[PDB]
């Protein structure tokens with residue numbers, strides 16, 4: 001555990017670096033107009049956005065410096081440089097999506113291009129394209145070949161976006177990733193005792209610095225948010241997870257650590273596909289008098305709604321998932337449905353919750369999921 | 382020459398891609414405020430900057446797609462992925478310098494960090510740290526060891542900045558790189574016939590797409606500039622050259638292709654070090670009535686000037702390099718010295734030249750240098 005010792009020493013130095021540099025560059029981002037308002041707060045001040053660029057940068061300098069230590073053989077060297085190319089490309093693309101505000105078309109396609117070094121490394125290092133069925137005898141009728149490479153391409157696209165759309169409250173994005181990376185770190189140390197070690201000693205090389213830099217980011221992103229992580233971070237986070245999952249051969253376990261993100265993605269799916277009107281910001285509404293966050297709604301004319309739309313809505317209404325409020329004015333009759341997100345579903349079930357408590361609750365919900373996965377995979381039921 | 386055939390097919394597709402995408406993203410950059418005015422033109426309209434991000438992006442997608450072709454052994458695979466990590470990191474850092482407008486401190490240090498994958502690849506692939514003396518028996522008294530790795534670190538820092546400071550006129554930055562990359566391509570094809578082939582088949586993999594994408598950029602950057610290349614491109618260009626020079630083992634020949642850039646850097650050195658006052662923009666002044674570009678000056682109080690400053694200035698004045706105009710008002714006595722740049726020295730020698738002609742003249746001057754290098758290295762005097 002000597003390269004891991006070096007990896008931890010540089011990760012702690014990376015944490016110090018991230019914590020120190022984020023306030024040092026504040027000026028540059030406010031000047032560059034890379035900032036947004038805390039939409040769930042009465043304060044109209046603009047907080048610097050895209051701070052994941054600073055932690056992501058620190059992350060790259062750390063690992064570039066780390067490269068000779070696990071060697072001072074190329075099977076793990078190709079995977080190291082390759083994974084760093086896919087991550088660097090993603091922090092780059094993420095920052096450009098933050099700066100240029102790209103279309104949903106790019107939010108999908110470009111992460112597939114950035115994930116190519118991982119696919120190519122897997123191709124040249126002859127990766128096992130044959131998968132093992134985790135579900136019972138029902139879907140079991142397999143060398144997925146190109147469809148396995150399609151899966152690896154669509155993994156980075158899911159991971160980054162799933163984090164990115166489960167956001168809008170102080171320390172949720174950096175915080176959820178902090179639970180996920182820690183869950184992978186714990187898992188790596190357990191599996192570091194036997195069988196697959198080369199996969200977990202490798203995954204730890206990327207996860208220990210991702211954790212300590214994200215911690216340095218959360219130092220300024222936690223409530224009250226002084227800085228915002230931005231798309232740059234979601235892109236970086238998603239790809240680092242998708243990368244270690246792919247090359248470490250544990251994307252299945254990793255996707256189980258991603259349970260709140262998966263629920264949020266699917267619960268959002270009718271809005272994301274625009275079958276039910278999707279507003280630009282689906283973050284909860286602040287009740288200025290209460291101080292706590294109340295559910296956000298998407299009101300629209302019921303006549304304009306499609307046959308599939310009113311079907312999905314009425315099935316979700318009955319399943320006690322959405323809070324539908326129908327009204328009628330001089331303009332006509334409307335339908336004010338609940339904004340389909342895990343944050344608003346938590347406010348639907350537990351009522352209005354304060355911002356600091358709501359994030360903390362979601363992080364605990366993330367902690368519970370990791371316990372469920374760790375219980376499933378290690379017999380603790 | 383089959384992977385080279387594939388490399389050229391994708392490079393032509395890359396040229397088409399760059400030419401098509403640059404006007405498609407114009408909206409995003411104007412919105413993102415990533416734009417500047419053509420300071421040598423009367424028109425106050427803002428032209429989108431950082432377009433090197435689009436060509437640099439196209440470049441990365443091409444080469445990521447190219448990766449399996451020269452293989453479908455890891456000695457050239459590590460160098461390929463490694464060089465792409467150093468380049469991707471540089472397009473990323475360059476874009477952040479364009480967006481955040483970093484200090485001169487970062488313009489130097491950060492390119493050294495981005496060049497680490499090249500150094501590390503050279504370290505692991507056991508690169509020849511021992512250099513051969515090109516100059517005569519005078520400096521010949523050598524395993525430079527760490528000082529050779531210092532050289533490789535400072536190569537990317539020189540290459541990017543040297544291009545970046547020899548700019549400010551339509552198609553100079555993209556155009557000079559277009560002569561340099563073509564000079565390396567020609568040289569690679571000559572040396573592809575014998576001896577070192579693995580170094581030139583490798584250098585061509587990066588130079589053919591750099592050329593065809595930069596061509597696609599020059600399509601919109603040539604006079605009258607519709608778009609601006611930005612720091613993103615200078616960073617990308619510099620590193621791609623520094624990369625192929627380092628890994629291909631021909632940084633010496635490459636630095637001889639960089640002759641106008643070297644003269645411009647050293648001629649600028651008293652201003653860059655602030656021994657003689659350095660104005661923010663050292664680009665020539667447009668004579669609205671003439672239409673042609675006239676020399677730019679740096680006027681200052683002669684009393685405020687240091688003992689070394691007035692010494693360098695008077696040595697350059699006598700050497701017939703700077704045009705010094707001394708004046709005296711009620712405020713006191715001033716000194717209006719010529720802005721120390723190869724562009725203003727060309728206007729000092731040839732008089733006022735029109736912008737389109739001036740760039741074209743500098744590109745021809747770049748062409749002459751490549752002929753001088755090719756004559757030196759292949760006996761054509």
Ligand SMILES: CC(=O)N[C@H]1[C@@H](O[C@@H]2O[C@H](C[C@@H](O)[C@H]3O[C@@H](n4ccc(=O)[nH]c4=O)[C@H](O)[C@@H]3O)[C@H](O)[C@H](O)[C@H]2NC(=O)/C=C/CCCCCCCCCC(C)C)O[C@H](CO)[C@@H](O)[C@@H]1O
Pocket residue numbers: 035036037038039040049104107108154157158161162164165166167168169170171225228230231268272278279280281282283
């Ligand atoms: C539709 C959806 O879910 N869109 C949500 C998503 O939109 C993204 O806002 C950010 C800007 C926010 O960070 C802003 O939120 C504010 N903020 C931030 C942090 C905080 O603590 N407090 C706060 O007030 C701040 O003012 C900041 O500027 C970007 O514009 C980004 O591009 C947006 N990103 C997107 O719009 C992403 C869309 C992806 C569409 C889905 C496509 C499918 C992807 C998966 C495919 C997988 C398959 C292959 C399996 O996130 C929003 C919330 O952070 C939510 O309010 C918003 O509802």
Ligand SMILES: CC(=O)N[C@H]1[C@@H](O[C@@H]2O[C@H](C[C@@H](O)[C@H]3O[C@@H](n4ccc(=O)[nH]c4=O)[C@H](O)[C@@H]3O)[C@H](O)[C@H](O)[C@H]2NC(=O)/C=C/CCCCCCCCCC(C)C)O[C@H](CO)[C@@H](O)[C@@H]1O
Pocket residue numbers: 416417418419420421430485488489535538539542543545546547548549550551552606609611612649653659660661662663664
């Ligand atoms: C001091 C110096 O030479 N500084 C020149 C340098 O400044 C850089 O302007 C750009 C903004 C220009 O692209 C603007 O110029 C306009 N433009 C552009 C293209 C065109 O065709 N027409 C036009 O009008 C447009 O409005 C655009 O916004 C950036 O701000 C960049 O950060 C600047 N970059 C720097 O300031 C870079 C400084 C590096 C300092 C030297 C440090 C030493 C480096 C070498 C060390 C090597 C050793 C290790 C051996 O370049 C300037 C000109 O493009 C010139 O006017 C200016 O004089």
